[PDB]
Structure 1
Amino acid sequence: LDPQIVISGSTAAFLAIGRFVFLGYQRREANFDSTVGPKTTGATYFDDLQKNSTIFATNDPAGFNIIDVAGWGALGHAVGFAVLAINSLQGANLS
């Protein structure tokens, strides 16, 4: 199989559904983590290491920041290589 089509194709699908299908659902479940509350309430260096010091703002209308791009892109790459690797096993000698 052509890696460029399969890997890019799978990544596009996983980015497309993530942006257009599961974005609303994913955000709602992320607020279920708000009900419990913040991890720590302190002002020491080690307490600062547990806070969202940097907020990743995005200009995308739906709020599809880079962290979401990395998450959904990784699933597409993972699925893409699973498809390629399995299809490679066809026509393998002594393997």
Structure 2
Amino acid sequence: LDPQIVISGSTAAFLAIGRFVFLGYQRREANFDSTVGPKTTGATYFDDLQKNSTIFATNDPAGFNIIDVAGWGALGHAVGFAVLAINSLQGANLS
């Protein structure tokens, strides 16, 4: 199989559904983590290491920041190589 089509194709699908299908659902479940509350309430260096010091703002209308791009892109790459690797096993000698 052509790696460029399969890997890019799978990544596009996983980015497309993530942006257009599961974005609303994913955000709602992320608020279920708000009900519990913040991890720590302190002002020491080690307490600062547990806070969202940097907020990744995005200009995308739906709020599809880079962290979401990395998450859904990784799944597409993972699925893409699974498809390629399995298809490679066809026509393998002594393997």
| 1:27 CA drift (Å) | 0.0
Could you tell me how far apart the structure 2 residues matched to 1:34 and 1:72 are?
Answer: 22
The sequence identity of aligned pairs, in percent, is 100
Could you tell me how far apart the structure 2 residues matched to 1:30 and 1:65 are?
Answer: 14
Give 1:10-89 correspondences, 5 Å limit.
10-89=10-89
Could you tell me how far apart the structure 1 residues matched to 2:91 and 2:23 are?
Answer: 40
Runs of 5+ consecutive residues of structure 1 not aligned to the other structure: none
**Segments of 4+ in structure 1 off by > 6 A?**
none
Aligned to 2:7: 7
Could you tell me how far apart the structure 1 residues matched to 2:82 and 2:17 are?
Answer: 19
| 1:75 CA drift (Å) | 0.0
Instruction: Name the TM-score, length of structure 2 as normaliser.
Output: 1.00
Could you tell me how far apart the structure 1 residues matched to 2:91 and 2:50 are?
Answer: 51
Runs of 5+ consecutive residues of structure 2 not aligned to the other structure: none
Could you tell me how far apart the structure 2 residues matched to 1:33 and 1:42 are?
Answer: 19
| 1:25 CA drift (Å) | 0.0
Aligned length: 95
Instruction: Name the TM-score, length of structure 1 as normaliser.
Output: 1.00
